[PDB]
Design a protein around this ligand. Structure first.
Ligand SMILES: NS(=O)(=O)c1cc(C(=O)NCCO)c(SC2CCCCC2)cc1Cl
Ligand SMILES: NS(=O)(=O)c1cc(C(=O)NCCO)c(SC2CCCCC2)cc1Cl
Ligand SMILES: [Zn+2]
Ligand SMILES: [Zn+2]
Lengths: 261, 261
């Protein structure tokens, strides 16, 4: 019921999902005029990220992204409540315009962006219930650029051929999810925002790491070309590309940084 | 009562104005991956732009911008039909953040943007009729940077305290409208797009000049503080600020440039 293009694209999400036209929408451009150092922003700790290599985690193509389900023993420590993981997924562009991050920095897109979605398990029983509630969600965002081959991202990307079409599903052996995070995770942007997809609820505490990670040219091309947003038997297949929302206006507000330097 | 902020803002325009959720939407970010030189983009000529100083032209606050009405003897030569002027208007930011252009270049906003709207007068008897027809309109867009005081722009801005409220009108003596255009008008970006306001009809041939003009901080501050979207008697006044649309997905379009480097 929604897409990133045509008449069911982002300008039309607010018809069926009214929060997509409401306050606190994400993503936003992170630029110097709206940044403010806040010494209250201490390092997060990533607990239970080293997933059992004896467990399997479900990877899906849900027609909007590729998603890896995560166990609720994985969590962020350092916020006021515990936030437990529920899933990760990615956003990207296309080979002719390979600049499909959702957040931008000083007006510039990165190649792609990883989101690790968490919910407030101290207040709410599960992610779905949390998603529309106060303090409900926290997302860690990693900016991705082209560079050296990244073995850790390949622990996900090596499975993409098995989830080519909408509805398909693959099992990924546990690995250390912290390997997907960049250098100096102490350095981050922090703001209160929204889901960047429908239903766009304004219930997300965003942490965007300052430093990007690298993946190779081949890995980025794989991500951009491996998936379709249609079911296997659709007689009009569509490639899953450009699955990012445009930046939203952000006026009279700050993004807090854990770094001044 | 569409606006640029709050529940009637741009993510909701498609609820009432379906073409705002359609294809070919403007404005866009002008960046290298989608640019392509086209040697057939020869220079436009601006005919009848030197308006007599002994004549006067109506300036109006239309609740969304300030607009100057232009005579149909003013036209562009060099497109495949004659396009005659109908009006010019601006888009801008706000006093604390003067970054309100509609088009961006390599991710960066300019301070403001001037649009000079023309319609195909060879085919249509007026701009409203043209506005519904493919390439019915042609707009010239000038990017505006904070810089030196600009006496030519001030021929418009010096009247702003007289059109402070929606529906108000003032007369502006004629001046040479070509003085609002930048240097090297032969260098431009060209693309097929839309109105950037409701009803967002995809019927505009866009020409965005490569080079910006400058107006001063004081001229921007006057533009950003003088006007209201509301009538003079409205008990809930709204300042006319931040009257620009976010950039839109490309939808596979390229932008053609008359300059190669
Ligand atoms: N791009 S984002 O803002 O990180 C984000 C995306 C999704 C999400 O998976 N969207 C696609 C299909 O609806 C979800 S799904 C959401 C979480 C599970 C409980 C309710 C659905 C949540 C977030 Cl924060
Ligand atoms: N920002 S833009 O794309 O240059 C543009 C703006 C308007 C415009 O004046 N919009 C305010 C709505 O009240 C119009 S008004 C349109 C002018 C032709 C006659 C039909 C009204 C046309 C354009 Cl192209
Ligand atoms: Zn996401
Ligand atoms: Zn305009």
């Amino acid at each position: 019921k929604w897409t990133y293009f045509g008449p069911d694209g982002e300008n039309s999400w607010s018809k069926k999902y009214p929060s997509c036209g409401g306050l606190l929408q994400s993503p936003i451009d992170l630029h110097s005029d709206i940044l403010q150092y806040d010494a209250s922003l201490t390092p997060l700790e990533f607990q239970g990220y080293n997933l059992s290599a004896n467990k399997q985690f479900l990877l899906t193509n849900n027609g909007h992204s590729v998603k890896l389900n995560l166990p609720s023993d994985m969590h962020i420590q350092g916020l006021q409540s515990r936030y437990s993981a529920t899933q990760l997924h990615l956003h990207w562009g296309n080979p002719n315009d390979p600049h499909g991050s959702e957040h931008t920095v000083s007006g510039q897109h990165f190649a792609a962006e990883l989101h690790i979605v968490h919910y407030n398990s101290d207040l709410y029983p599960d992610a779905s219930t949390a998603s529309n509630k106060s303090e409900g969600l926290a997302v860690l965002a990693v900016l991705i650029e082209m560079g050296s081959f990244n073995p850790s991202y390949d622990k996900i990307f090596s499975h993409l051929q098995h989830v080519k079409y909408k509805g398909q599903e693959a099992f990924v052996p546990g690995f250390n999810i912290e390997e997907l995070l960049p250098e100096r995770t102490a350095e981050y942007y922090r703001y209160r925002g929204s889901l960047t997809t429908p239903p766009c609820n304004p219930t997300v505490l965003w942490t965007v790491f300052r430093n990007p990670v690298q993946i190779s040219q081949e890995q980025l091309l794989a991500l951009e070309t491996a998936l379709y947003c249609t079911h296997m038997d659709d007689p009009s297949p569509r490639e899953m590309i450009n699955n990012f929302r445009q930046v939203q206006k952000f006026d009279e507000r700050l993004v807090y940084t854990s770094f001044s330097q």
